[PDB]
RNA sequence: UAAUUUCUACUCUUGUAGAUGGAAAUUAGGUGCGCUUGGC
DNA sequence: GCCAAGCGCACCTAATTTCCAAAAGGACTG
DNA sequence: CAGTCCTTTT
């Protein structure tokens, strides 16, 4: 049957190693001498500057493109509605084919194949896009052909530089290919014409109808809008929102204005906002009258448009001036420091503020914009104020005191400036008080700021903290004066207002200069960015092969178990090219790699043979055959049914399988396939490349099902490494005279002192060199390699004096780890620098600690404290599979299928805990159980929470913020570690949350990654797990958007009702509590249940639910039990296995203030409360008696509303309090042997917290699919769980 | 919808009234109000 | 409060454990501050 | 003392595309 | 031209 070691070779994998290359000898020097570190250095930089100018041509053509594209968009249109609707796999499939068609309909105006234009158009258009991709973006032909723009001076010296190394782009050519593809790819602009904005357009057409249709006076209030903002001028707002406009929506420059339509423009901060159609569609439901609850029940925010691919950004708001220097910002603020000071700006303010003591106080005026910041500055709450004002108004109205006269005074407080006197008057004289306080504060603030002296300049956080706090101190004063109106609108006093607004022109800078500041202070510091090495060869390590060492320059030694880098420079003058000169195996030296390639040869055959411009050029006229003999031991003969089989009229080739699934000429595809196959045969053994191999492995062509099939077979079969000894004299003399610059491949498994396990990487790359992979290769070495140097990033200080000593963060137990507070503390103390006495707690650990004298000097971020070469070089495994799998979770359900003993990890992401484990048997039953907030006893949870409040705090402070991927990789390593081990020793599946229903999307990816390619330092390379037979567990990662449910082992499951289900019984609150909210409802809510009586032997209370009942308030989960005994627990003392004490039947409950408002929570003890109110009411219930229709007998609106609140109670079996760390599972209902599940009890057969009850309910999901595999006919898994089938599964096992 | 007394006599109840010919009307579904400034959406039926 | 191709956690061990697909290009989103109009 | 819609700046993070090449082709230099 | 070596290709 199937085996688990079945799962690997399955496909192809790719990695890059990286290393570091120590230099030897001579060569270091003669890099220097030749000044190759310096032109490579300066080859970067030119191609930073250069590379925005040659962009300028890119985005140009595509605008120039854009502009004459014109579709009818119905059909799109009609594809997405038709797939929304059905949801099947028909319809996803015609969408699919329709944006192909769009894209290429978009992709023919590029390349001047569109019927849309005249035909010279297309001609050149044709003609620019024939050199986008090549040296023709230097010569300037292309921008000729463009427009009556030319290059500076300074442009073409940039071209120029470049000159003999224009392949130095050959990268950015497929990175702007990926620009203008047809293709159905994210970098591309059709996709985002046809699949990111066009759905996006077609919805906000959609919004606006329904919208103008519902509240019609919302066409004319969208119109104006537009007008206000100036844009569309010729364009109706209907007409903007209807398809034929989105062929206007296509470039850059008219999806910013249609942007800034929904958005709206700024101007200088302070200034007030030109509305979008999104902002005045906010502000309409924000009126919270009849109108906003229609509009708001309708969509009602239009969607942006995503840019265009490449284009500029460009803005209608304001943008600031960019400060450039550290001088530039304490220059300027020191001369409108000084400026201030001479203009008297403080004491003019500390004069206007005094008057607030005498002058008539009717005259002055609050903003009501500023209302509720004063209320908050100077008063209790936001709301003191308002409130205040709002009581001793409605106590000035004659009268009947209507609804509709209170609503008025409301209203009139929003729309009306306050003179100070009325709000004096209505709140305290606190308020005068505390306004004095605050006015002092602010200018006590403000004098000190100008009074002290700026720095020298903003290198240090010191500095930088010493202009913000200086800067926040006028916006302390420029936000007071701020509270005043000064409008004319009023009757302010007419010197007041002259005098205020005096001061507020002269304080308005300091929000530009705030902003200017901060926008350059919060800069990212200079960093030293590594970069590629040429050594003066445009394609250095661009390909190992033997024929190409002479272009390349990259070869590779072996010698005494270290591996070595040959590189081989063009240097300053004339030399002979260096030539290996093998010797006697016995002779004392290096071993050189021979490796012998031809790659693909899909691509390759057809290059060197039927794609020669020669043969295109003949079977163009002629139709008689060709024969080649140029690299071909003997002629090869090419017929025009060949080439014509290989260069189609049009697309499929015939002996591709989209032929056969379109023309169904399965007996022409196999007649094809065979000739072609004999085409590459005849090749192969003629081309002076391949003549040599043995091709003996290799079926009859007729034998082979598809061309992929015959290529996965053929390609293993190019490739060969073999080594020759090369003397030890001739590569020493080389290094010598500097024809090769000789690097050491180096990590720290090759340091003198190495002596535990080796890295991953190291075995990859050991096992690639090993015997057994040179004679079958497991892993080939590939090419591109890239060689960088690194310059010094951090300063030498070392981190260890040699008198110090250094603190073991584990105590002589090598396990307890010393507390976080007490690290630092008790370093300082065995280093004899404490200047305080020691911590009590820390002289309790002292003598349990263990220090270390540094016999050697060592340097924290030594690795950054000095110039380094690396090395990058990338290696494929199970190089003898295919490129990409066959059926590969068919193979997974097959061995599923075969072995249901198969254990289930299941892995939630927790509300207390970053990731929680619970493994299970195939009967459900858990194996293990546990959170990994906490691996190799450090706590990765408390680091990453106190990590991002520092990041927080950073922002906030313009200090530097830093990373957080790097701890949370850190992390998400470990996590990794253990998961897969457990995979590995319990042969089991792994199912995670879906999160189509942080940590874990991280996780979730390096996890599928992982078992891509499964290799176990300690398995031996020869078994499966090892170097040369990796596993491979989960399917070939492509994409998240291409992931289905299931990947391999890895299974994707709902989250719903997962956590708060019962893990005894299944049992989850059958009620949505929005449709119980009126006294008629929760009346009907309780006349549902059959009874409520006491139980005298156990002092619960049992309320009877039939399931086929009150389905007005069920979520229509029926699941499988008909009814539920549902428990008030008698609030008793019960003891957990370590012996805590626990109230059973507790809830934790929101506390809850009059309306609406939660902030703290509360316990709650239903039983007790429900005994509370019986014997309130005098209601007889220990003879066992019904309780319900005596509680709703009279309709006592607390009674019955006690009641509801308290069942809703019962039914929370979730309870959790951060403040006390409490997040239990307490069921309502008993099992079948009478028994209400507590957490708390902690036993361990079931989940001990209500994380650890998410973890196993996602294992048992993944049990159902399991289990609904074994039954199946075929090895395809169901698509999904609904929530019903969840529950009636779970339920029937339980009962 | 325009539509005569005359016409459709098999679907009728043999009252032709005073009126030979109806136009009847599906209004666009907008928001009204009424005196008190209550809205309502015109047009609306409540059907089983 | 230290050593690394690089990251994280370490320090019996001049190093240990685990991880590690690079490079280029692009796009989306997030956090923080400032401001605008509004809502409680 | 939060929130809604939005505009401006700083930086950080994550997703998705291409390549992972020997040799044909042809520009450049005596 | 004939060779060399960067550019472009399948
Ligand atoms: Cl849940
Ligand atoms: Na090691």
């Given at each position: 049957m199937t085996q688990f070691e079945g799962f690997t070779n399955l496909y192809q994998v790719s990695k890059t190693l990286r290393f570091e290359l120590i230099p030897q000898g001579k060569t270091l020097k003669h890099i220097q001498e030749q000044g190759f570190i310096e032109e490579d250095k300066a080859r970067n930089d030119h191609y930073k500057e250069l590379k925005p100018i040659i962009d300028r041509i890119y985005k140009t053509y595509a605008d120039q493109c854009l502009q004459l594209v014109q579709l009818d968009w119905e059909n799109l249109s009609a594809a997405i509605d038709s797939y929304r609707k059905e949801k099947t796999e028909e319809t996803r499939n015609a969408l699919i084919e329709e944006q192909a068609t769009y894209r290429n309909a978009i992709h023919d105006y590029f390349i001047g194949r569109?019927?849309?234009?005249t035909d010279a158009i297309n001609k050149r258009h044709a003609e620019i896009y024939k050199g986008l991709?090549?040296?023709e973006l230097f010569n300037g032909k292309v921008l000729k052909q463009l427009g009556t723009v030319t290059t500076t001076e300074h442009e073409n010296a940039l071209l120029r530089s470049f000159d003999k190394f224009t392949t130095y782009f050959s990268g950015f050519y497929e990175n702007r290919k990926n620009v203008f593809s047809?293709?159905?790819?994210?970098?591309?602009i059709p996709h985002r014409i046809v699949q990111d904005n066009f759905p996006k357009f077609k919805e906000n057409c959609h919004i606006f109808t329904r919208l103008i249709t519902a509240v019609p006076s919302l066409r004319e209030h969208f119109e104006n809008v537009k007008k206000a903002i100036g844009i569309?001028?010729?364009?109706?707002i209907e007409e903007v929102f209807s398809f034929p406009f989105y062929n206007q929506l296509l470039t850059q420059t008219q999806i910013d204005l249609y942007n800034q339509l929904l958005g709206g423009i700024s101007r200088e901060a302070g200034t007030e906002k030109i509305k979008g159609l999104n902002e005045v569609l906010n502000l309409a439901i924000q009126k919270n009258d009849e109108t906003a609850h229609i509009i708001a029940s309708l969509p009602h925010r239009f969607i942006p448009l995503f840019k265009q691919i490449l284009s500029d950004r460009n803005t209608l708001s304001f943008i600031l001036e960019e400060f450039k220097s550290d001088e530039e910002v304490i220059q300027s603020f020191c001369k409108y420091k000084t400026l201030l000071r001479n203009e008297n700006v403080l004491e003019t303010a500390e004069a206007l503020f005094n008057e607030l003591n005498s002058?008539?106080?009717?005259h002055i005026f609050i903003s009501h914009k500023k209302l509720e910041t004063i209320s908050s500055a100077l008063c209790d709450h936001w709301d003191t104020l308002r409130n205040a004002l709002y009581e001793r108004r409605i106590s000035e109205?004659?009268?009947?005191?209507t609804k509709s006269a209170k609503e008025k005074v409301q209203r009139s407080l929003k729309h009306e400036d306050i003179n100070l006197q009325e709000i004096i008057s209505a709140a305290g004289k606190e308020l005068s008080e505390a306004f004095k306080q605050k006015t002092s504060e602010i200018l006590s603030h403000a004098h000190a700021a100008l009074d002290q002296p700026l720095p020298?300049?903003?290198?240090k956080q010191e500095e930088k903290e010493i202009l913000k706090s200086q800067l926040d101190s006028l916006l302390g004063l420029y936000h007071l004066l701020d509270w005043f109106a000064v409008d004319e609108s009023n009757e302010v006093d007419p010197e007041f207002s002259a005098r205020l607004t005096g001061i507020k022109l002269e304080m308005e800078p300091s929000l530009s200069f705030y902003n200017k500041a901060r926008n350059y202070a919060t800069k990212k510091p200079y960093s030293v960015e590594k970069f590629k090495l040429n050594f003066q060869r445009?394609?250095?390590?661009?390909g190992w092969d033997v024929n190409k060492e002479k272009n390349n320059g990259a070869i590779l030694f072996v010698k005494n178990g270290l591996y070595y880098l040959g590189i081989m420079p063009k240097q300053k003058g004339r030399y002979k090219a260096l030539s290996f000169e093998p010797t006697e195996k016995?002779?004392?030296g290096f071993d050189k790699m021979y490796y012998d390639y031809f790659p693909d040869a899909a691509k390759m055959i057809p290059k060197c043979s039927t794609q020669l411009k020669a043969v295109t050029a003949h079977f163009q006229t002629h139709t008689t055959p060709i024969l080649l003999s140029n690299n071909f031991i003997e002629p090869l003969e090419i017929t025009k049914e060949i080439y014509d089989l290989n260069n189609p009229?049009?697309?499929?080739?015939?002996?591709?399988?989209a032929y056969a699934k379109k023309t169904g000429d399965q007996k022409g595809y196999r007649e094809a396939l065979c000739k072609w196959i004999d085409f590459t045969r005849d090749f192969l053994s003629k081309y002076t490349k391949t003549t040599?191999?043995?091709?003996?492995?290799l079926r009859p062509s007729?034998?082979?099902?598809?061309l992929g099939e015959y290529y996965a077979e053929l390609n293993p079969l190019l490739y060969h490494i073999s080594f020759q000894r090369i003397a030890e004299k001739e590569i020493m003399d080389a290094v010598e005279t500097g024809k090769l610059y000789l690097f050491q491949?180096?990590?720290?498994?090759?340091?003198?002192?190495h002596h535990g396990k080796p890295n991953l990487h190291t075995l990859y790359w050991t096992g690639l060199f090993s015997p057994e992979n040179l004679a079958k290769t497991s892993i080939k070495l590939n090419g591109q390699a890239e060689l960088f140097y690194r310059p010094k990033s951090?300063?030498?200080?070392?981190?260890?004096?040699?008198?110090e000593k250094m603190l073991n963060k584990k105590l002589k137990d090598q396990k307890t780890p010393i507390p976080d507070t007490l690290y630092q503390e008790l370093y300082d103390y065995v280093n004899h620098r404490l200047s305080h006495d020691l911590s009590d707690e820390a002289r309790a650990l002292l003598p349990n600690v263990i220090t270390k004298e540094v016999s050697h000097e060592i340097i924290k971020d030594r690795r950054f404290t000095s110039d380094k070469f690396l090395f990058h070089v990338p290696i494929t495994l199970n190089?003898?599979?295919?490129n990409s799998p066959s059926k590969f979770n068919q193979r997974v359900n097959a061995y599923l299928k075969e072995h249901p003993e198969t254990p289930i990890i299941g892995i939630d992401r927790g509300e207390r805990n970053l990731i929680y484990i619970t493994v299970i048997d195939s009967t459900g039953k858990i194996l293990e159980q546990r959170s990994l907030n906490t691996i190799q006893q450090f706590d990765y949870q408390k680091k990453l929470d106190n990590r991002e409040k520092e990041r927080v705090a950073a922002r906030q402070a313009w200090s530097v913020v830093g990373t957080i991927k790097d701890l949370k990789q850190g992390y998400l390593s470990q996590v990794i570690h253990e998961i897969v081990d457990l995979m590995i020793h319990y042969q089991a599946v792994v199912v995670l949350e879906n999160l189509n229903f942080a940590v874990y999307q991280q996780f979730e990816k390096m996890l599928i990654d992982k078992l891509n390619c499964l290799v176990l330092?300690?398995?031996?390379?020869?078994?499966?797990?090892?170097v040369l037979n990796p596993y491979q567990?989960?399917?070939?990662?492509?994409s998240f958007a291409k992931m289905?449910?299931?990947?391999g082992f890895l299974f994707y499951v709902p989250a719903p009702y997962t956590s708060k289900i019962?893990?005894?019984?299944?049992?989850?609150?059958?009620?949505?509590?929005?449709?119980?909210?009126n006294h008629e409802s929760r009346k009907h809510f309780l006349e549902g249940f059959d009874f409520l009586h006491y139980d005298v032997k156990t002092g619960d209370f049992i309320l009877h639910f039939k399931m086929?009942?009150?389905?007005?308030?069920?979520?229509?989960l029926p699941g499988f039990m008909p009814a539920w005994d549902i428990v008030f627990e008698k609030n008793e003392t019960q003891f957990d296995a370590k012996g805590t004490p626990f109230i059973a039947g507790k809830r934790i409950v929101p506390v809850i203030e009059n309306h609406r408002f939660t902030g703290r929570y509360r316990d709650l003890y239903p039983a007790n409360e429900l005994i509370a109110l019986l014997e309130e009411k005098g209601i007889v219930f220990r003879d066992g008696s019904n309780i319900l229709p005596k509680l709703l007998e009279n309709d006592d609106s607390h009674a019955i509303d006690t009641m509801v609140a308290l069942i809703r109670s019962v039914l929370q079996m979730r309870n959790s309090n951060a403040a006390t760390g409490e997040d239990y599972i307490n069921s309502p209902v008993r099992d079948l042997n009478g028994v209400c599940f507590d957490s708390?009890?902690?036993?361990?057969?079931?989940?001990?917290?209500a994380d650890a009850n998410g973890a196993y309910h996602i294992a048992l999901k993944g049990q159902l699919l399991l289990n609904h595999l074994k039954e199946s006919k075929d090895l395809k898994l169901q698509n999904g769980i609904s929530n019903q089938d969840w529950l009636a599964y779970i339920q029937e096992l339980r009962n």
């Amino acid at each position: 049957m199937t085996q688990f070691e079945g799962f690997t070779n399955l496909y192809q994998v790719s990695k890059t190693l990286r290393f570091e290359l120590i230099p030897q000898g001579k060569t270091l020097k003669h890099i220097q001498e030749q000044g190759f570190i310096e032109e490579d250095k300066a080859r970067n930089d030119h191609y930073k500057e250069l590379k925005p100018i040659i962009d300028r041509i890119y985005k140009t053509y595509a605008d120039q493109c854009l502009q004459l594209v014109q579709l009818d968009w119905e059909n799109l249109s009609a594809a997405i509605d038709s797939y929304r609707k059905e949801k099947t796999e028909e319809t996803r499939n015609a969408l699919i084919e329709e944006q192909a068609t769009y894209r290429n309909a978009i992709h023919d105006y590029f390349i001047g194949r569109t019927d849309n234009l005249t035909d010279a158009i297309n001609k050149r258009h044709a003609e620019i896009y024939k050199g986008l991709f090549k040296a023709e973006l230097f010569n300037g032909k292309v921008l000729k052909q463009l427009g009556t723009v030319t290059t500076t001076e300074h442009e073409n010296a940039l071209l120029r530089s470049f000159d003999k190394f224009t392949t130095y782009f050959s990268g950015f050519y497929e990175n702007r290919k990926n620009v203008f593809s047809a293709e159905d790819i994210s970098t591309a602009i059709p996709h985002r014409i046809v699949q990111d904005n066009f759905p996006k357009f077609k919805e906000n057409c959609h919004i606006f109808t329904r919208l103008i249709t519902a509240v019609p006076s919302l066409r004319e209030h969208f119109e104006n809008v537009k007008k206000a903002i100036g844009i569309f001028v010729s364009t109706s707002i209907e007409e903007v929102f209807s398809f034929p406009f989105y062929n206007q929506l296509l470039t850059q420059t008219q999806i910013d204005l249609y942007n800034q339509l929904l958005g709206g423009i700024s101007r200088e901060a302070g200034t007030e906002k030109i509305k979008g159609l999104n902002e005045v569609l906010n502000l309409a439901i924000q009126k919270n009258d009849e109108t906003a609850h229609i509009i708001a029940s309708l969509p009602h925010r239009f969607i942006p448009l995503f840019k265009q691919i490449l284009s500029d950004r460009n803005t209608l708001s304001f943008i600031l001036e960019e400060f450039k220097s550290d001088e530039e910002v304490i220059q300027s603020f020191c001369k409108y420091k000084t400026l201030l000071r001479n203009e008297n700006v403080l004491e003019t303010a500390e004069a206007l503020f005094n008057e607030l003591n005498s002058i008539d106080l009717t005259h002055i005026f609050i903003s009501h914009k500023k209302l509720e910041t004063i209320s908050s500055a100077l008063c209790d709450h936001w709301d003191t104020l308002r409130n205040a004002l709002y009581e001793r108004r409605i106590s000035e109205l004659t009268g009947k005191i209507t609804k509709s006269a209170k609503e008025k005074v409301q209203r009139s407080l929003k729309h009306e400036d306050i003179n100070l006197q009325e709000i004096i008057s209505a709140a305290g004289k606190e308020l005068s008080e505390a306004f004095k306080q605050k006015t002092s504060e602010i200018l006590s603030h403000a004098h000190a700021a100008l009074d002290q002296p700026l720095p020298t300049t903003l290198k240090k956080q010191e500095e930088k903290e010493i202009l913000k706090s200086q800067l926040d101190s006028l916006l302390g004063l420029y936000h007071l004066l701020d509270w005043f109106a000064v409008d004319e609108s009023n009757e302010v006093d007419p010197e007041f207002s002259a005098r205020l607004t005096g001061i507020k022109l002269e304080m308005e800078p300091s929000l530009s200069f705030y902003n200017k500041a901060r926008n350059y202070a919060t800069k990212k510091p200079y960093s030293v960015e590594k970069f590629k090495l040429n050594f003066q060869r445009p394609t250095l390590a661009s390909g190992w092969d033997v024929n190409k060492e002479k272009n390349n320059g990259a070869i590779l030694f072996v010698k005494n178990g270290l591996y070595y880098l040959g590189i081989m420079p063009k240097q300053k003058g004339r030399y002979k090219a260096l030539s290996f000169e093998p010797t006697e195996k016995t002779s004392e030296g290096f071993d050189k790699m021979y490796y012998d390639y031809f790659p693909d040869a899909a691509k390759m055959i057809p290059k060197c043979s039927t794609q020669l411009k020669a043969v295109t050029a003949h079977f163009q006229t002629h139709t008689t055959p060709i024969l080649l003999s140029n690299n071909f031991i003997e002629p090869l003969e090419i017929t025009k049914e060949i080439y014509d089989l290989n260069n189609p009229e049009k697309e499929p080739k015939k002996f591709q399988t989209a032929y056969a699934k379109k023309t169904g000429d399965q007996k022409g595809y196999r007649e094809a396939l065979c000739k072609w196959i004999d085409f590459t045969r005849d090749f192969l053994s003629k081309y002076t490349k391949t003549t040599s191999i043995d091709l003996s492995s290799l079926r009859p062509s007729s034998q082979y099902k598809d061309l992929g099939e015959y290529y996965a077979e053929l390609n293993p079969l190019l490739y060969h490494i073999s080594f020759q000894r090369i003397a030890e004299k001739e590569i020493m003399d080389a290094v010598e005279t500097g024809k090769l610059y000789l690097f050491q491949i180096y990590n720290k498994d090759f340091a003198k002192g190495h002596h535990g396990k080796p890295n991953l990487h190291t075995l990859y790359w050991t096992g690639l060199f090993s015997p057994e992979n040179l004679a079958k290769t497991s892993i080939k070495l590939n090419g591109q390699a890239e060689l960088f140097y690194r310059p010094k990033s951090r300063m030498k200080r070392m981190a260890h004096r040699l008198g110090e000593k250094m603190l073991n963060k584990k105590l002589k137990d090598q396990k307890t780890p010393i507390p976080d507070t007490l690290y630092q503390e008790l370093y300082d103390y065995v280093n004899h620098r404490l200047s305080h006495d020691l911590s009590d707690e820390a002289r309790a650990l002292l003598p349990n600690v263990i220090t270390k004298e540094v016999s050697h000097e060592i340097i924290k971020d030594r690795r950054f404290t000095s110039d380094k070469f690396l090395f990058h070089v990338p290696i494929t495994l199970n190089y003898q599979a295919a490129n990409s799998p066959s059926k590969f979770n068919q193979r997974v359900n097959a061995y599923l299928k075969e072995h249901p003993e198969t254990p289930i990890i299941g892995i939630d992401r927790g509300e207390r805990n970053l990731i929680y484990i619970t493994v299970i048997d195939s009967t459900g039953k858990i194996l293990e159980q546990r959170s990994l907030n906490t691996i190799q006893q450090f706590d990765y949870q408390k680091k990453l929470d106190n990590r991002e409040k520092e990041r927080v705090a950073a922002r906030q402070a313009w200090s530097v913020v830093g990373t957080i991927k790097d701890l949370k990789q850190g992390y998400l390593s470990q996590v990794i570690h253990e998961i897969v081990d457990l995979m590995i020793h319990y042969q089991a599946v792994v199912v995670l949350e879906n999160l189509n229903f942080a940590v874990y999307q991280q996780f979730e990816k390096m996890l599928i990654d992982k078992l891509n390619c499964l290799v176990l330092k300690d398995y031996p390379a020869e078994k499966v797990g090892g170097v040369l037979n990796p596993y491979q567990l989960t399917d070939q990662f492509t994409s998240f958007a291409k992931m289905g449910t299931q990947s391999g082992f890895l299974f994707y499951v709902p989250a719903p009702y997962t956590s708060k289900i019962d893990p005894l019984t299944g049992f989850v609150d059958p009620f949505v509590w929005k449709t119980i909210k009126n006294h008629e409802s929760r009346k009907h809510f309780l006349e549902g249940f059959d009874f409520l009586h006491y139980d005298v032997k156990t002092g619960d209370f049992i309320l009877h639910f039939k399931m086929n009942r009150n389905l007005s308030f069920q979520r229509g989960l029926p699941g499988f039990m008909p009814a539920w005994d549902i428990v008030f627990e008698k609030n008793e003392t019960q003891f957990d296995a370590k012996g805590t004490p626990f109230i059973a039947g507790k809830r934790i409950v929101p506390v809850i203030e009059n309306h609406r408002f939660t902030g703290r929570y509360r316990d709650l003890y239903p039983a007790n409360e429900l005994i509370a109110l019986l014997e309130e009411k005098g209601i007889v219930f220990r003879d066992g008696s019904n309780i319900l229709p005596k509680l709703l007998e009279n309709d006592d609106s607390h009674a019955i509303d006690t009641m509801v609140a308290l069942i809703r109670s019962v039914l929370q079996m979730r309870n959790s309090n951060a403040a006390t760390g409490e997040d239990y599972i307490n069921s309502p209902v008993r099992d079948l042997n009478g028994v209400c599940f507590d957490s708390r009890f902690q036993n361990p057969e079931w989940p001990m917290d209500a994380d650890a009850n998410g973890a196993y309910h996602i294992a048992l999901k993944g049990q159902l699919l399991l289990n609904h595999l074994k039954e199946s006919k075929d090895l395809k898994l169901q698509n999904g769980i609904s929530n019903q089938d969840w529950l009636a599964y779970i339920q029937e096992l339980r009962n």
